[PDB]
C-alpha cells in the first residue's frame, strides 16, 4: 500500500490543522521515498550539515489559485534543499499529470534537479506536465491548504509564516 504522511501546519501563531498526503510509491517509488523520509527525518544529517527533515521548514512561496511551495529546509527561500540521495536526483518518470487540486509534484531548476522542494497544487496545472514529477496527492485536510492559500500573494510572498510545525508518516 502507498505510504501516507502528514504535515501539522502553523499559520502565524495559529494551529491550522493536519494535511495528510498519499505518496504514489507504486508509480514513483524513488520520488515518494525521498519525500517520505524527509517527513520522518530518518536519514539524519545531510551534506549541508542540516537534518534531512521538513520539520520546522516553511512554505516560502504561495500563489493563490496556483500552488503552495515548500521543502527548502536548508535556506528557507527557494535556493536550497537537498535529497536523501545526495544533492539532486534524476526525474524518475512523467507518467502522472497535474490533474487537479491536491496534487503533489516536485519543484526543480530544469531536468534532473530534484532535491527537497515540492508543491501542492490548488488547481489543475497541466502546463507543468512532463517537466515536474507528480508523486502524490492530499487525501485529507485539503481545507488546511485552502487556509494556507489565503495567506499567499500573487508574486508569492506570504503575509504570515506558513510552517510545518510537525510531520511524519502514519
Amino acid at each position: 500500500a502507498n505510504p501516507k504522511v502528514f504535515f501539522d501546519i502553523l499559520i502565524g501563531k495559529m494551529k491550522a490543522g493536519r494535511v495528510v498526503m498519499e505518496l504514489f510509491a507504486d508509480v514513483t517509488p524513488r520520488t515518494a521515498d525521498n519525500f517520505r523520509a524527509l517527513c520522518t527525518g530518518e536519514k539524519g544529517i545531510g551534506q549541508a550539515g542540516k537534518a534531512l527533515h521538513y520539520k520546522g521548514s516553511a512554505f516560502h512561496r504561495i500563489i493563490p489559485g496556483f500552488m503552495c511551495q515548500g521543502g527548502d529546509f536548508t535556506r528557507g527561500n527557494g535556493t536550497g534543499g537537498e535529497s536523501i540521495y545526495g544533492a539532486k536526483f534524476q526525474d524518475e518518470n512523467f507518467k502522472l499529470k497535474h490533474t487537479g487540486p491536491g496534487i503533489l509534484s516536485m519543484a526543480n531548476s530544469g531536468p534532473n534537479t530534484n532535491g527537497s522542494q515540492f508543491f501542492i497544487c490548488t488547481d489543475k496545472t497541466a502546463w507543468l506536465d512532463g517537466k515536474h514529477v507528480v508523486f502524490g496527492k492530499v487525501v485529507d485536510g485539503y481545507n488546511v491548504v485552502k487556509a494556507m492559500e489565503k495567506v499567499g500573494s500573487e508574486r508569492g510572498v506570504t503575509s504570515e509564516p506558513v510552517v510545518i510545525e510537525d510531520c511524519g508518516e502514519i
Binding site: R61, I63, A107, Q117
Partner: peptide, 11 residues
C-alpha cells in the same frame, strides 16, 4: 522553480 523564479506560473 528552485533558485531563479521566472515568468508565468512556474515552480
Amino acid at each position: 522553480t528552485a533558485g531563479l523564479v521566472l515568468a508565468x506560473l512556474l515552480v
